[PDB]
Write a protein that binds this DNA or RNA. Structure first.
Ligand SMILES: [Mg+2]
Ligand SMILES: [Mg+2]
Ligand SMILES: [Mg+2]
Ligand SMILES: [Mg+2]
Ligand SMILES: [Mg+2]
Ligand SMILES: [Mg+2]
Ligand SMILES: [Mg+2]
Ligand SMILES: [Mg+2]
Ligand SMILES: [Mg+2]
Ligand SMILES: [Mg+2]
Ligand SMILES: [Mg+2]
Ligand SMILES: [Mg+2]
Ligand SMILES: [Mg+2]
Ligand SMILES: [Mg+2]
Ligand SMILES: [Mg+2]
Ligand SMILES: [Mg+2]
Ligand SMILES: [Mg+2]
Ligand SMILES: [Mg+2]
Ligand SMILES: [Mg+2]
Ligand SMILES: [Mg+2]
Ligand SMILES: [Mg+2]
Ligand SMILES: [Mg+2]
Ligand SMILES: [Mg+2]
Lengths: 204, 107, 134, 176, 190
RNA sequence: AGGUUUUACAGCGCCCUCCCGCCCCGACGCCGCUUGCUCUCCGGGGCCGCGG
RNA sequence: AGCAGAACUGGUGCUGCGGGAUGAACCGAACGCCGGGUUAAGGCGCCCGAUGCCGACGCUCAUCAGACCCCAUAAAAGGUGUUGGUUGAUAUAGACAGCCCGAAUCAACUAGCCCUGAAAAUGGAUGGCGCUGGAGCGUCGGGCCCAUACCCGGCCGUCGACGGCA
RNA sequence: UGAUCCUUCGAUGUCGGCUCUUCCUAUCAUUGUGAAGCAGAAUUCACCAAGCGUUGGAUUGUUCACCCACUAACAGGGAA
RNA sequence: GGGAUUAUGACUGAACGCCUCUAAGUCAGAAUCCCGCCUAAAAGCAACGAUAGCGCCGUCGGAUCUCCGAUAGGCCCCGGGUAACCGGGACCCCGGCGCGGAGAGCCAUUCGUGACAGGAGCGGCUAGAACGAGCGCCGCCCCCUCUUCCAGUGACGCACCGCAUGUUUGUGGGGAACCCGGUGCUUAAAUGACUCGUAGACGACCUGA
């Protein structure tokens, strides 16, 4: 990307919580619409027991006199990521509240976005920002063990989504093999046009 | 289209002091301080639409208005630039589109 | 699983830095971070470059460790590194990326008209081979 | 001392101020590693004033010039004898480094003494720097690079340029 | 410090077929198929040789914590080779003072029902793990043999029985009742 | 520790000379400090020229 | 003792401003009204201006990690956690370990980070989010951010003029 | 309990009990454990742990005591 | 009623030829914790019913007045791995890998109106429910395509006399009003009073006419 997209759809799998939230919160302040899918695929650095204790310590932050007013401990990985981004926004102002409106978080890839291209932020990936010997905690498992009740259905609809996307990619490879076969059959019919692309480095 | 996309990211400021006479712009594909040299001096434009119609130079009157400016210098090392406009940009434009014209051309 | 190693004579490609884009020969390994590189035929004097700016190629010359530039040049010309490099696809991607970055507005127009007609000929037969397969 | 950037080697020689009682006093040469000659002249009056009875005002500096590396293109093993004051006491310490220049090896020592022992530049006193042969190296981290036909890959290349494409459909490859 | 190279080869017998898919060792022998995924140690596992190729485990630029896993992974593959050729026989004996520990095996060796432990009326039903078969050994009074391919499954199955016959609220030095592992051997002796 | 024992089927030092053997590059994307008034219709950006 | 009483100097009272989240007193810097430039102290993942450097080297995993003047607590004593260092002793007349085997091993001490030591009452505080190839610690480089400070200019007033005109 | 006198003297209602809620753990009991100068029974030491419980009375205005019984235990405290 | 686990007891197994619950990797594990059960139901929402002259497709409705946003080609889709991976072919082989079978790219896209030479709208079918298609696959009508590119010949479309808000999505989204030819349904509901008393301070709530 890096093109001032109309709607930037980022995949959450393999990304770090605060590493992605820091970049997402800056995009929504610049007027960009961000959609983070598969928030259960986000992973947090540190072993699972550490990050779970941090959320369990957050669960205890209820208001003593009336917990219905206190901190709303959201259990879904989407709303967990949504609040992590909210912590990096001036959400109590008008420009910060309008920033949260530009962010849409989803557990898994819903039908509005399963037929879209998901982006990846390499400055927030676990494979890039973490050493291979460090432990990390998946936000899907962390959420399930603090009160998320929709982990099995999200995993069921995701495998249903991958089997459907795998069927198309097989058809897309067949269409690409016929495309590369077409280029060899009309090689003498497009040689005048390839040389224009070869001359200016468009084709190697 | 003959203008590059920019974003009004905010005014030139510290942390607890805001200087509205200078605006900070976010260019589209410019993320180094060395790549802003092309845009230094280009005329900026905040095109917006109001309720009442206004005069349009070279056309029929519409409800389109504009606040002209210019990219003055670079800001930081991440392609951000400073811009000064004829009138200070309204704070409602923070995060909106700013037109960076290709003139004054130096190429 | 690894095929390219940091060894004495490994021709490395400088990814970034002062001599960015030129080939050098790893003559000696200083530490786990730096190497004593020397490009006698590419225009890079002998110096210490970090390993993060070096991209290992598939070329190795027969040169002892910490040998003079006189003998590194002989191993560089015997193995024909400059010839084998320019024939590689990675060196050709560099040349193509420079030709495309130097395209003018008239060059981008001539390319726009070429791909607009070249793709139509490919897309027309792609639909023909697709209908023949059904 | 701050140890800003590289620590260039300076040959600072000095002597007491000559007098009618002591004409032509003895000359003392030092091997000072400092970022600039101003600090090198000041480091001289710190190590010499604690060895001989001569202050900056009691004596003068006769020469203070750079000592260039005689073999900047040859990988050498440097053995450095130093003493540093920790939070508890002073300790004599011998450390080995491997650099192209002497000033580069001493610069590595200040970066390493602060990393492993939290020693600041003012607490370190470099006593001796010597080009050690590969046969007389005592540290195993230096002797591992004393293998002819050394071979190792670059496994798990950490992705740099993480923000050139800040957003991309391609996940980075770490194997090359 | 970072060690440049730390390797350790593992000889493979001719009646064994070890295949590698990245860091997934699939050992094939006359007794069965074992498959361990080593996608967590981050090593280089090469298969050197052509006539019954060996297994070489590499670690480049590894600290002391990472060099300790080189022999750990080599020892795990050796257990996979030892498990598909000789097997593992973790036989354990029932120790009691007064109440004989009556152990009956069910479900073709996949379930162990322990009765009369310290005269308790509670029946302890210990279920084995997949690939582990339990049986009351013959020619011995209270011996319990456990056979299988994976050592970590035969050993854990024996720990489940040993920890099931645990005395509570008593001096365990005085009440030595239980079923404790006595010998850690193989099914086929070589 | 390349080739089979110290140059051999690679190389790496250190001395004695040979006009410093002699030529060639002078801090040069391998490493410093500066004019002994550094030279440029020598370029580019921003700011404002108020008075009289 | 954020106690009481002195000495030097500064500050404050009488004083706003940049920074230390917050603040009387710390740090920088003291103030006519402004534009441009550049800084100080302090910073540059996001809140939040600025590192979106292909920053250098190392150290460090914490099931209470750590995160910078004043400053918002932690010790004695310990760790076969881990990394340095110091000083000895056995070793191819075969050590150490395991029951012959065949190459380094053992001991004391010390120093970094981490760990134990480490218990309070409404739910809560490196400022928050969060950060573990780091957004942590130590040693540093380059660039960058702005104070009512500095520099240039415009204007206002005050003061001075060894000032100008009847 | 003092020491201090920073806040409050154009007033912050002053001991105890009753009542009622929540919180702390430096754990009496209960759950899961380790240790013993643990044979059993009983008890002691220690760990995770405040989920749950921690009484009815005589005397005294009493907090604090003391005693009567009961009880798994009749643990200690905070919240102006 | 479950789950992940605490303390703890263990497994495999190095570091450290042995040993070792730990280093990587595993097991059992609780009045704890979280959840379920249970209670509440959001400036959260779904399905469905019924909708009083009022509303639809008209086909691209034509021509008019009002507000309110932005924007200024793209709605480019395997799963993923990273001490690896991708493509192709009957586990193996071949090919590509600083990754051109490349989101640093790719697909679009570069003034018109009329006379000339080269270059390659209806019916079927199957499928989409996580917040459902701005769908696809076939065979028939509609005209003859600036379809697209390279070359031309002779003409005109203000060439508005150096100058800004142009250009896209856009046939945008909200209102209320105004003219032409075909279709939907107009025995709609809520509420007051009365009543009920499974309710209740009053509203509300359960009812019945
Ligand atoms: Mg007992
Ligand atoms: Mg006092
Ligand atoms: Mg004063
Ligand atoms: Mg002041
Ligand atoms: Mg503070
Ligand atoms: Mg200013
Ligand atoms: Mg800050
Ligand atoms: Mg201590
Ligand atoms: Mg102790
Ligand atoms: Mg230690
Ligand atoms: Mg601590
Ligand atoms: Mg002035
Ligand atoms: Mg006082
Ligand atoms: Mg009152
Ligand atoms: Mg009062
Ligand atoms: Mg009151
Ligand atoms: Mg406790
Ligand atoms: Mg004790
Ligand atoms: Mg369980
Ligand atoms: Mg454990
Ligand atoms: Mg378990
Ligand atoms: Mg291949
Ligand atoms: Mg014609």
């Amino acid at each position: 990307a890096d093109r001032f997209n109309k709607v930037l759809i980022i995949d959450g799998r393999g990304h770090l919580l605060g590493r992605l939230s820091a970049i997402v919160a800056k995009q929504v302040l610049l007027g960009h619409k961000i959609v983070v899918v598969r928030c259960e695929g986000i992973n947090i650095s540190g072993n699972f027991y550490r990050n779970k204790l941090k959320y369990l310590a957050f669960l205890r932050k209820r208001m003593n006199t009336n917990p219905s007013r206190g901190p709303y401990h959201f259990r879904a990985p989407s709303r967990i990521f949504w609040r992590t981004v909210r912590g990096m926004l001036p959400h109590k102002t008008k420009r910060g509240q309008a920033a949260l409106d530009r962010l849409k978080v989803f557990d898994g890839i819903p039908p509005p976005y399963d037929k879209r291209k998901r982006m990846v932020v390499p400055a927030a990936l676990k494979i890039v920002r973490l050493k291979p010997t460090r432990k990390f905690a998946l936000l899907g498992r962390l959420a399930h063990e603090v009160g998320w009740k929709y982990q099995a259905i999200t995993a069921t609809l995701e495998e249903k989504r991958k089997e459907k996307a795998k069927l198309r990619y097989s058809k897309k490879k067949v269409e690409m093999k016929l495309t590369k076969q077409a280029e060899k059959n009309v090689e003498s019919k497009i040689a005048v046009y390839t040389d224009v692309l070869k001359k200016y480095g468009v084709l190697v | 289209r003959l203008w590059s996309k920019a974003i009004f990211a905010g005014y030139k400021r510290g942390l607890r002091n805001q200087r509205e006479h200078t605006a900070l712009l976010k260019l589209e594909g410019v993320y180094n301080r060395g790549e802003v040299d092309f845009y230094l001096g280009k005329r900026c434009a905040y095109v917006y639409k109001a309720k009442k119609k206004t005069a349009t130079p070279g056309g029929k009157p519409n409800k389109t208005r504009v606040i002209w400016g210019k990219v003055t210098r670079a800001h930081g090392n991440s392609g951000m630039v400073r811009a000064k406009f004829k009138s200070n940009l309204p704070a409602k434009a923070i995060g909106h589109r700013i037109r960076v014209m290709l003139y004054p051309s130096r190429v | 699983v690894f095929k390219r190693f940091v060894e004495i004579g490994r021709v490395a490609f400088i990814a970034f830095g002062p001599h960015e884009g030129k080939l050098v020969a790893i003559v000696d390994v200083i530490d786990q971070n730096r190497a004593l590189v020397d490009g006698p035929c590419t225009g890079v004097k002998r110096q210490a470059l970090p390993f993060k700016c070096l991209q290992l190629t598939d070329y190795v010359i027969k040169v002892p460790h910490s040998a003079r530039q006189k003998y590194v040049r002989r191993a560089w010309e015997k193995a024909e590194i400059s010839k084998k490099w320019e024939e590689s696809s990675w060196a050709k991607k560099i040349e193509a990326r420079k030709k495309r970055a130097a395209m003018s507005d008239f060059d981008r127009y001539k390319v726009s008209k070429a791909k607009k007609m070249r793709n139509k000929i490919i897309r027309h037969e792609m639909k023909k081979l697709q209908k023949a397969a059904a | 001392m701050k140890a800003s950037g590289t620590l260039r080697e300076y040959k600072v020689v000095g002597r007491l101020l000559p007098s009618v009682k002591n004409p032509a006093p003895p000359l003392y040469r030092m091997r000072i590693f400092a970022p600039n000659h101003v600090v090198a002249k000041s480091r001289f009056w710190y190590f010499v004033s604690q060895l001989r009875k001569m202050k900056k005002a009691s004596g003068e500096i006769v020469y203070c010039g750079l000592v260039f590396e005689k073999s900047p293109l040859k990988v050498k093993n440097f053995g450095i004898w130093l003493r540093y004051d920790s939070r508890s006491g002073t300790h004599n310490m011998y450390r080995e480094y491997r650099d192209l220049t002497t000033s580069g090896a001493v610069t590595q020592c200040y970066r390493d003494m602060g990393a492993r022992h939290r020693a600041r530049a003012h607490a370190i006193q470099i006593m001796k720097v010597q080009v050690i042969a590969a046969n007389k190296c005592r540290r195993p981290a230096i002797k591992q690079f004393h293998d002819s036909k050394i071979k190792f890959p670059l496994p798990h290349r950490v992705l740099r340029r993480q923000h050139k494409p800040r957003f991309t459909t391609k996940r980075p490859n770490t194997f090359f | 410090m970072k060690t440049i190279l730390s390797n350790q080869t593992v000889d493979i017998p001719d009646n064994v077929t070890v295949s590698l898919k990245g860091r997934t060792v699939t050992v094939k022998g006359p007794r069965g198929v074992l498959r361990r995924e080593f996608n967590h140690i981050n090593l280089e596992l090469s298969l050197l040789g052509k006539k019954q190729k060996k297994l070489r485990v590499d670690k480049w630029w590894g600290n002391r914590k990472e060099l300790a896993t080189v022999r750990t992974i080599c020892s795990h593959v050796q257990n996979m080779i030892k498990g598909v050729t000789l097997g593992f026989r973790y036989k354990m004996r029932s120790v009691y003072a007064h109440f004989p520990i009556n152990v009956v095996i069910q479900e073709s060796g996949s379930l162990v029902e322990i009765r009369n432990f310290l005269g308790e009326k509670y029946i302890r039903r210990v279920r084995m793990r997949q690939g582990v078969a339990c049986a009351v050994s013959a020619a011995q009074k209270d011996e319990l043999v456990l056979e299988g391919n994976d050592i970590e499954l035969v050993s854990n199955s024996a720990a489940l029985i040993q920890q099931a016959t645990t005395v509570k609220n008593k001096d365990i030095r005085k009440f030595l009742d239980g079923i404790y592992v006595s010998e850690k051997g193989t099914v086929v002796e070589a």
